[PDB]
Design a binder for this molecule. Structure first.
Ligand SMILES: C[S@@+](CC[C@H](N)C(=O)[O-])C[C@H]1O[C@@H](n2cnc3c(N)ncnc32)[C@H](O)[C@@H]1O
Ligand SMILES: C[S@@+](CC[C@H](N)C(=O)[O-])C[C@H]1O[C@@H](n2cnc3c(N)ncnc32)[C@H](O)[C@@H]1O
Ligand SMILES: C[S@@+](CC[C@H](N)C(=O)[O-])C[C@H]1O[C@@H](n2cnc3c(N)ncnc32)[C@H](O)[C@@H]1O
Ligand SMILES: C[S@@+](CC[C@H](N)C(=O)[O-])C[C@H]1O[C@@H](n2cnc3c(N)ncnc32)[C@H](O)[C@@H]1O
Ligand SMILES: C[S+](C)CC[C@H](N)C(=O)O
Ligand SMILES: C[S+](C)CC[C@H](N)C(=O)O
Ligand SMILES: C[S+](C)CC[C@H](N)C(=O)O
Ligand SMILES: C[S+](C)CC[C@H](N)C(=O)O
Lengths: 161, 161, 161, 161
């Protein structure tokens, strides 16, 4: 009865896979590209969706890291989750489920800490999450800012005097 | 240049994904249904293929178990690997790779121990692997033979006197 | 030459295990109990320590979650990491390593998001991390605030008008 | 009431950890060194023990592999499990449990396929398991026989004519 974000028929909304009546991909207007938006309210501590995708050996812009050498290619859903330094969802890559870390109001962008699942990103980027504590430049957890990132961080540091 | 077993274009034979010039699905003639056959010779201790599929929460006839609550739906390749009590390949479900446990000659069926990756099967079955040490009735590692399996095993045990 | 936090001789500082010349357990003075303090400066994106402990099946106050059914009992080091809603370290429970999520100055408390590795805590607690965005009441990622937590969160919500 | 193989008090026999009234380490008399022996009968498909040990980054003679980069140091129990090419137990390294793959009679040596959990061994060895289908020379699943192993395997192959 409910229509799923994932195109595969075997992934059913009645089993927890995301529905287009609950999640929507939209183009942000603040330089973050496209991202997942929630259309209903979620209390903190609830499973918002089961997650799926295709196994691949290679890190890509729309993969998530499963373990040391294996990634999950999901350009329909979890790969379109935007980053925030203060995230409102956790993507559990062992149970393959998305959970609310806080109360999320309908219409809010869904955000994970990319460094919470990823050793290294496909690309580093300057962060537009707006949080009071923005790392400003976003990497994997096991990844040093590259020389562009170090230069931008230094200009911000001088400004901090 | 080489054509892949997996229909997805993103899975390339040049990156280790199986090619139809190396693997073939055939119908066995001894009651094992269809299964994967190798068309080239492989020395023991080599990676024969990278493995892929679709993440799902549910055990199915053509899934393999990833971890406690997550399975890999692969009806094109790894889900068509037949069982043997003396296996010639290992399916590594952390690196998602198939490795030869022994020298395999071209034309041989590829066989894993289903109990080496699976807690519980979608279905139990009487084993036709022919090995001198056949469990005769095949389950997951964490799965008791059901009452059919116990009855067949008992008739075999009486015969053993 | 360097003395290790972990009592076991097989865990050597020269292999990355924490040294008492780099980490110290101290009693906080703001209601967080004891916690790990760093004694040297760490740039973001560096491995600060290898982690170890004892495998156990049971969640405890000083365990960390490895996977769905397995935890790591470590009362010497990683179990004494305090929580923060804006963490400065990530505890990678697959590689068993601690990594700096930001620049950390010598003397700073080390903090992880408990919800980033834990489904459920041994106990919930009101948070004293001070971050502008404190969840105020801390649970596992897959754990609803209990009735004490809901009552405290509601009093805070009324105050927010 | 029951005394545990693991020296730690926190690992209780009442929670499934092995008891010396069920398991015993003995010196084999056929060139396999010491190994774990079972003292009670176990039907196939039962959990014989919970497993534990110390996390370490390094492969050792008495470690078992957890994931790509992490091993479990257990010289009291699971590291003393001998190898067999036709194993009677599976060591589940995700749930950290030992399960019977077949009916095991009291007094039998417990045997796993080392290649079922290990990419690479600390050392390769000629196999004395006696199975009709012995690989004769034992490696990790992702490990080629070294030049000693290749030489011994070739002498056996000539004998096979
Ligand atoms: C695979 S994407 C997620 C979807 C992507 N925005 C898209 O439009 O297809 C990851 C990329 O999104 C952008 N992005 C995500 N979070 C961001 C943030 N907080 N600030 C700026 N850019 C962000 C970055 O360009 C990053 O490399
Ligand atoms: C998903 S299948 C593998 C592919 C399957 N044969 C097919 O034809 O689609 C697993 C099933 O194959 C059959 N099978 C596999 N190995 C077998 C064996 N050694 N002896 C008998 N049947 C076997 C069993 O019916 C088992 O439930
Ligand atoms: C196992 S402990 C870490 C070490 C512990 N403080 C100790 O003193 O042994 C986890 C507990 O520390 C306390 N704690 C950790 N982070 C905290 C925080 N940010 N605010 C308040 N209490 C915290 C809580 O009581 C929580 O249950
Ligand atoms: C860590 S051990 C297990 C305990 C060891 N036997 C001990 O005595 O401490 C692994 C080693 O045991 C021996 N071993 C285990 N299984 C064997 C087998 N089936 N045949 C010959 N040697 C074996 C090998 O020397 C191998 O390197
Ligand atoms: C949520 S996915 C966009 C994050 C990881 C991805 N491999 C990236 O590089 O951004
Ligand atoms: C190699 S797959 C056929 C084995 C596991 C599968 N879920 C089954 O039930 O047979
Ligand atoms: C960093 S450990 C203190 C967090 C998880 C632990 N099991 C707890 O309950 O707090
Ligand atoms: C059961 S443990 C003895 C097997 C793996 C170990 N690291 C070895 O090298 O034999």
């Amino acid at each position: 009865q409910r229509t799923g974000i994932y195109p595969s028929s075997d992934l059913k909304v009645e089993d927890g896979y995301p529905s287009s009546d609950t999640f929507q991909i939209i183009q942000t207007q603040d330089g973050r590209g496209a991202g997942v938006r929630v259309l209903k309210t979620f209390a903190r501590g609830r499973r918002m969706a089961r997650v799926s995708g295709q196994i691949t050996a290679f890190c890509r812009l729309h993969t998530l890291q499963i373990n040391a050498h294996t990634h999950l290619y999901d350009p329909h859903f979890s790969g379109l989750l935007l980053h925030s330094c203060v995230p409102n969802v956790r993507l559990d890559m062992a149970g393959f489920e998305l959970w609310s870390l806080r109360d999320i109001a309908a219409g809010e962008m869904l955000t994970m800490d990319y460094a919470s699942t990823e050793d290294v990103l496909m690309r580093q980027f300057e962060c537009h999450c707006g949080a009071p504590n923005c790392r400003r430049w976003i990497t994997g957890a096991k990844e040093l800012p590259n020389d562009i990132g170090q230069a931008l961080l230094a200009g911000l540091r001088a400004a901090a005097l």
